[PDB]
């Protein structure tokens, strides 16, 4: 029943043109440096995760220009560790959780319990997300977002990692519209981690989904290899919706007159 | 061997609807909604109890065991056609014009052999299946399995049921006749639907409907919720994706006081409405409001007429004397509610229970053998309660004799600032000595184990104590309230001002208030006056509990009587393991029983 700790941050960084984003970094200590993450996982934010027990603590330290918040969609938190914020009656020293001013950090303690975790029938570990609740809208498509993985009694690493499993990847197929954001800059754009068509850095096989998009939205992720399997049964391919995550050289395209033919493609 | 009918008189109507009305700007249209009704003459239409508050623009809840046998006698008062099918069994009705539907509920339509006894189906309209749904023509089919539903078709088990339709409204498809009229909605409301309360770490059991076009799709989130997947095969789901068309029912299993939302969580759209409040209950809310404890004021009661002396002053469970409770001379109340007694909690709360009681004059016996409770937020808008209830309204069962205590439960817990009992038949006269139970509303507000025992001796400890060699010895881990006996309290060994009782809540807690009572031992009326708070972490270095701007200490009113009880509440919460109560005014001798209150961190 250990604790697990991080201090993830918001700040603010360009990216690829190029525009004024958003994001979630990592960070270690306290708050020195991050040790960012070049292959793939473009705009998404950390990954974070603990097991059954773990009282877990996440350090938030904003720095962008808007306040923002830790809104984990996976946990049974307090009031004073949720991360929203609308009319639930509480007093101020609940309501400091809601919303972190640009330049100040606060903690958010997660007592991740037994009755809140995976089931049996289920994936070793559970893949929800986490976002800001501040503004639902615009924190989000200003790459604000990131994984969050309940696992069971001895599957998760001492290190954070897969245990008996292993090597698990991310991908977020989330369109993204900065036209709705930090700027009123008019941008579509089908991506899959920020990434475009192309220009995300694959990886080669030696042989954990998300699906943010704002509005009303369904993706249906093909992957071209049967590694995909759910539970005690293959499906051909996944399906995602606008905000609900799930958990060699080839292709991950989604056959959808608007996401394959837009660029929407992870090349496994 | 089944095949039991079930008997449902549902019109369809014109109404106004107000989307919004408990939160925009005018937002109310002419609909037309499936309503309820007692009989086949659709005269008198059968009152929404508190169970179905939620449904909103709903129809009544269509609901059957398997191999059962649904008939519904379908009236229509609405200006055109419309038509009731019900989606799942497995024609254009005329205005003013009546058809009875027969369906056959098989097991094509029941939930599965494992998980959740009861899955959800759906009826509407179906002459135009989206002009008609959109105009407001759809209601909640459930189809349990045998044993489920009760002699008055209700889920006992899992119990509490919800059903939380997420779907928009789009005017521009109804009586529109003639900008965005689209309503991003819960069961036909925006930002609030009321009438969603649950207890603490209780079941209950969710039926969630889309039945809106395919740019729905909407993400239900319950906030510091875990939703469950209940069938041949179990998940934890954390939001669960309700896809267009679609009906799934899921379990879950509230957690924490408190008031959450819940969401499409689909950005744009939650925005734009798709959300609601949804309270949690304390766990163990059912504790006495104040009339037996004198926590009421004799101010707060008040009725409407009293027999000669019985005054509603009286009406205080165990309260006893020659006048000792309320009598009225007549319970005439009919489908009148005259003859009342009113409760005003001068604040909102959350009433769990009621507890009644007779009178005896001297040996001719007095008492209430039924009533009917109503509540009101204002004291201008009253509600009957109803909730279990086979009539209009609950007519709960009385007290036999005049001194035994009758208890009684409120089905689902309601919001009220005035409770208003009538009594509606009795022996002799109604008589009643009553106690209500409940809570506050924001929850944490529940003992702490004091009075229980949960809070054991070896952690109460005061500065001193006496001992009297008459066998009379009064240990501080005695102040515990409502104590009775030899020594029932704490006895101060001296009665000066540096005295201290202080309690090891043994982690960090919130306490929200705490309950002050005297002792009356050796006919001696002895008692704390007047308090100070001091609150430790670790155990040693104290600081003086102040108001929101102050520097001098907190000086809290006790008690000014032996057995009566005196309530203070911590406008700022007090976090903390260690808790310090100073006498600094007293009566005789300093002597104690308390109570704290709060929740876990
Ligand atoms: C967004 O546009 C520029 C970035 O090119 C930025 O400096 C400015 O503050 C924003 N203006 C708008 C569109 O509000
Ligand atoms: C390339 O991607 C952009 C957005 O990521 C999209 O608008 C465009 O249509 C794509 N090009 C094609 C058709 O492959
Ligand atoms: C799951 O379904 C079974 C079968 O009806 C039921 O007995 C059990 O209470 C359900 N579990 C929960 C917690 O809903
Ligand atoms: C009942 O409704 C029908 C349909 O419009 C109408 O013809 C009839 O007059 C109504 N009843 C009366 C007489 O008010
Ligand atoms: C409510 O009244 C009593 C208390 O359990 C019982 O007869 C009835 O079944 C209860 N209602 C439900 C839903 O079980
Ligand atoms: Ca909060
Ligand atoms: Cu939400």
Redesign the pocket.
């Given at each position: 029943a250990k604790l697990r700790q991080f201090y993830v941050a918001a700040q603010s960084i360009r990216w690829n043109t190029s525009?004024?984003k958003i994001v979630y970094r990592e960070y270690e200590a306290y708050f020195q440096k991050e040790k960012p993450q070049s292959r793939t996982s473009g705009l998404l934010g950390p990954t974070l995760y603990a097991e059954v027990g773990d009282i877990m603590k996440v350090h938030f330290k904003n720095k962008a220009h808007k306040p923002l918040s830790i809104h984990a969609q996976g946990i049974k938190y307090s009031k004073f560790s949720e991360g929203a914020s609308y009319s639930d009656h509480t007093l101020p020293m609940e309501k400091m959780d809601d919303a972190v001013a640009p330049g100040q950090e606060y903690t958010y303690e997660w007592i991740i319990s037994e009755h809140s975790g995976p089931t049996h029938d289920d994936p070793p570990c559970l893949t929800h997300i986490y976002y800001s609740y501040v503004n639902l809208v615009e924190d989000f498509n200003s790459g604000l977002i990131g994984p969050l993985l309940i696992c069971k009694k001895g599957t998760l690493t001492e290190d954070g990692t897969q245990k008996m499993f292993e090597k698990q990847h991310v991908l977020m197929f989330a369109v993204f519209d900065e036209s709705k954001s930090?700027?009123?800059?008019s941008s579509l754009m089908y991506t899959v981690n920020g990434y475009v068509n192309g220009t995300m850095p694959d990886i080669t096989v030696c042989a954990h989904l998300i699906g943010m998009s704002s509005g009303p939205e369904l993706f249906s992720i093909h992957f071209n290899g049967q590694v995909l399997e759910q539970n005690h049964h293959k499906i051909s391919a996944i399906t995602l919706v606008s905000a609900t995550s799930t958990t060699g050289r080839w292709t991950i395209a989604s056959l959808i007159p608007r996401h394959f033919q837009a660029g929407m493609q992870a090349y496994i | 061997n089944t095949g039991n009918r079930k008997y449902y008189y549902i019109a369809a109507e014109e109404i106004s609807w107000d989307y919004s009305k408990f939160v925009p700007e005018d937002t109310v249209y002419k609909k037309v909604v499936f309503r309820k009704y007692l009989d086949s003459t659709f005269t008198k239409l059968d009152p929404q109890g508190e169970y179905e508050e939620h449904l909103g623009i709903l129809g009544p809840v269509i609901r059957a065991e398997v191999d059962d046998v649904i008939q519904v006698r379908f009236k229509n008062l609405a200006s055109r056609p419309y038509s009731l099918h019900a989606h799942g069994l497995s024609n254009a009705i005329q205005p003013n014009k009546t058809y009875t539907y027969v369906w056959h509920a098989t097991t094509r339509s029941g939930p599965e052999n494992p998980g959740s006894a009861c899955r959800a189906w759906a009826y509407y309209s179906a002459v135009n299946p989206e002009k008609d749904i959109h105009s407001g023509l759809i209601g909640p089919l459930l189809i349990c399995r045998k044993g489920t539903l009760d002699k008055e078709t209700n889920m006992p088990v899992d119990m509490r049921e919800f059903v939380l339709l997420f779907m928009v409204f789009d005017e521009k498809k109804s009586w529109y006749y003639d900008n965005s009229h689209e309503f991003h909605a819960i069961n036909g409301m925006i930002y609030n639907l009321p009438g969603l309360r649950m207890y603490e770490q209780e079941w209950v059991r969710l039926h969630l409907l889309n039945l809106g076009g395919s740019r729905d799709i909407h993400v239900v989130h319950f906030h510091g919720q875990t939703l469950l997947e209940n069938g041949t095969q179990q998940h934890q789901l954390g939001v669960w994706p309700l896809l267009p068309g679609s009906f799934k029912t899921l379990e879950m299993k509230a957690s924490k006081p408190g008031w959450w939302l819940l969401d499409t969580e689909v950005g744009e759209i939650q925005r734009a409405g798709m959300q609601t409040p949804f309270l949690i209950v304390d766990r163990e809310c059912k504790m006495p409001m104040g009339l037996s404890t004198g926590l009421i004021a004799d101010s707060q009661i008040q009725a409407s007429e009293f027999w000669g002396y019985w005054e509603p002053k009286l009406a205080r469970l165990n309260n006893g004397g020659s006048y000792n409770a309320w009598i009225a001379e007549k319970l005439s109340t009919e489908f009148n509610p005259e003859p009342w007694i009113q409760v005003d909690m001068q604040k909102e709360v959350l009433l769990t229970g009621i507890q009644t009681q007779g009178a005896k004059h001297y040996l001719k016996p007095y008492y209430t053998t039924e009533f009917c409770v109503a509540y009101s937020l204002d004291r201008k808008n009253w509600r009957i309660f109803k909730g279990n209830s086979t009539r209009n309204v609950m007519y709960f069962g009385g007290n036999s004799d005049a001194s035994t205590i009758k208890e009684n439960q409120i089905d689902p817990p309601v919001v009220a600032r005035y409770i208003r009992i009538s009594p509606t038949g009795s022996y002799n006269k109604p008589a009643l000595r009553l106690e209500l139970q409940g809570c506050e509303v924001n929850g944490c507000s529940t003992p702490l184990g004091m009075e229980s025992g949960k809070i054991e001796n070896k952690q109460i400890t005061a500065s001193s104590f006496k001992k009297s060699w008459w066998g009379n010895y009064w240990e501080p881990f005695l102040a515990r309230l409502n104590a009775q006996g030899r020594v029932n309290a704490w006895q101060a060994k001296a009665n000066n001002n540096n005295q201290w009782l202080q309690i090891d809540l043994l982690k960090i807690k919130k306490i929200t208030a705490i309950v002050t009572q005297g002792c009356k031992s050796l006919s001696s009326e002895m008692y704390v006056k007047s308090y100070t708070i001091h609150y430790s972490d670790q155990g040693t270095d104290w600081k003086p509990y102040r108001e929101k701007s102050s520097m001098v200490d907190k000086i809290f009113e006790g008690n000014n009587n032996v057995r009566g009880h005196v309530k203070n509440f911590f406008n700022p919460p007090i976090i903390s393991r260690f808790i310090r109560i100073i006498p600094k005014t007293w009566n005789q001798s300093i002597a104690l029983r308390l109570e704290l209150f709060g929740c876990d961190m």
């Open positions: 525009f004024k930090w700027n009123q800059t | -």
